[PDB]
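Closing statement on the adenosine-5'-diphosphate sub-project.
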Amino acid sequence: LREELQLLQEQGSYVGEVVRAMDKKKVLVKVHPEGKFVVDVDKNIDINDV
Amino acid sequence: GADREVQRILLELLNQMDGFDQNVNVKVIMATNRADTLDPALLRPGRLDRKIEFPLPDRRQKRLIFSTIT
Amino acid sequence: DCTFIRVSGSELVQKFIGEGARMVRELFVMAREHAPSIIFMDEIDSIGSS
Amino acid sequence: XXXXXXXXXXXXXXXXXXXXXXXXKXXX
Amino acid sequence: ASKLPLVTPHTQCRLKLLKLERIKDYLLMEEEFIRNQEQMKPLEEKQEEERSKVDDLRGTPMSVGTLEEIIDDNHAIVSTSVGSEHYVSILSFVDKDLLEPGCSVLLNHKVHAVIGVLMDDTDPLVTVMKVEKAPQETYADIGGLDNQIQEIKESVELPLTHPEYYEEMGIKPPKGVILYGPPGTGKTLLAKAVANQTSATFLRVVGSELIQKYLGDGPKLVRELFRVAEEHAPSIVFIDEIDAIGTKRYDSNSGGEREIQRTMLELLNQLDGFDSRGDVKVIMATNRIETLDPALIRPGRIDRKIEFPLPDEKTKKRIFQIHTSRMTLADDVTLDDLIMAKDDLSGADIKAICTEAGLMALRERRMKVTNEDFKKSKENVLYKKQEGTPEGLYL
Ligand SMILES: Nc1ncnc2c1ncn2[C@@H]1O[C@H](COP(=O)(O)OP(=O)(O)O)[C@@H](O)[C@H]1O
């Protein structure tokens, strides 16, 4: 609880929907309002899980 | 560009028309003059069941309306 | 003595764009999975499209 | 059968945000 | 890729034997030069070094825009997802050749420069109108035409399959073919049979479905039809049933019929007015031929007109055989009981008989085939014709 005050003075995270992935560890995501983005995946996740 | 936005409200209307709980006391009353140019998805068992018309008066009801106003 | 399947599917599914390309797919998976089955339909496409 | 139509507009919404660590004086 | 554009002998002349073996020499030697690169300095210079220079050059989040216009060579105008438009320069990393307006791109953050292109999807209009695969039976289905088969083959197939004779005399093939005759003859069959055995794309269009309750959409569907047919492939455009949609200017009225006049007027120009469309095969099918607009009938648009008669006792013996080729046949039946007798009934009537005998047998839950199946089926198909006939006695 004492540590907690700094951790919520920290930026949030977006949520989007994967249309479909393509080669070289990238996907294609419309977020909520805006266009579609070709972005990077994490190192903890896999391409096959998408 | 428009009737998409119009009909998706009707879908939003019908979705939250169906699933209250059949226990929460919410009464919904709607009224028009023209009961003809309607979607029969409103005219389903579960959403809108009671259908009440307000017709023109007759000789007895003309006497009753004349009595109250005068 | 066949597995009856009633599909109402009137217009609330006609609006659904992103899953509109799969609602027939897994439904026909469901027909060939459960039993000798019989799928029933109605006016719903003719009100939607001709 | 041979009938024209007009149209309409559905304008999108707009929103903006910043880091908000900028002071607006510089005067005086 | 576009290695040498010359084809001009176009025969067994010794010139092509010399030129193509020069091309054999310049390609072997280019290979044998470059084979001695991975032999003596077999270095991997640009596996990731080309990539990591550029993946670090572009941003890690990519954003999809939309082309609007293209200006001189590097800077073009784009559109963001909301409508904010940016006059940004493209790089020499994207294929400039598949960069036409109305396409998605990839952008940057700071300078918003065009970095890459996203590939397109398949248009729905091909999936609507194109008979996608080889649909149905081949020339084992048809009953003895052998002259009508010969005309459509040398008008479409032999021009397409073996083009060598037209370019000897320099004479272009004829363009348009009309299929006409009494209904129930096999006009839809002959289109689908050529659609079965083909090498180019085939397009089927029902002509009655070209009348919209809006307006302007008549010519709009036409001008997109040949646009798709030209841009896609070598193409064969078949439009069934043009007789009740494009007949003539019969009264020059208004209110819909004037719109139908405008749709055929666009189709007439979209068929042939300007900049000859090239590798576009047009095949049209009618029942009636007389009440057609002669501006379509003139050459330059349609050059082949093929009558479809009705054989009497000769090709029917296979049409009765082919429609009974996949079914049972008990020994009590003779097809000559019906072939020899009446001489006018259509091949569609023969199919109507050969299905009804299968209907009459299994309705009564019986075994294979009786003669009285073919008796009652022929009697029924008479009333299938006659009950819609107002004819009295000699008119
Ligand atoms: N020569 C034939 N061989 C086999 N079947 C035939 C023949 N002629 C007609 N038919 C039958 O009749 C039908 C003919 O279709 P078609 O005459 O093209 O209809 P329409 O002319 O009204 O478009 C086909 O379904 C086919 O089964």
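Chain E touches chain A through eleven residues (CB under 8 Å). With this model delivered, the sub-project is considered complete and its resources will be redirected to Aim 3.
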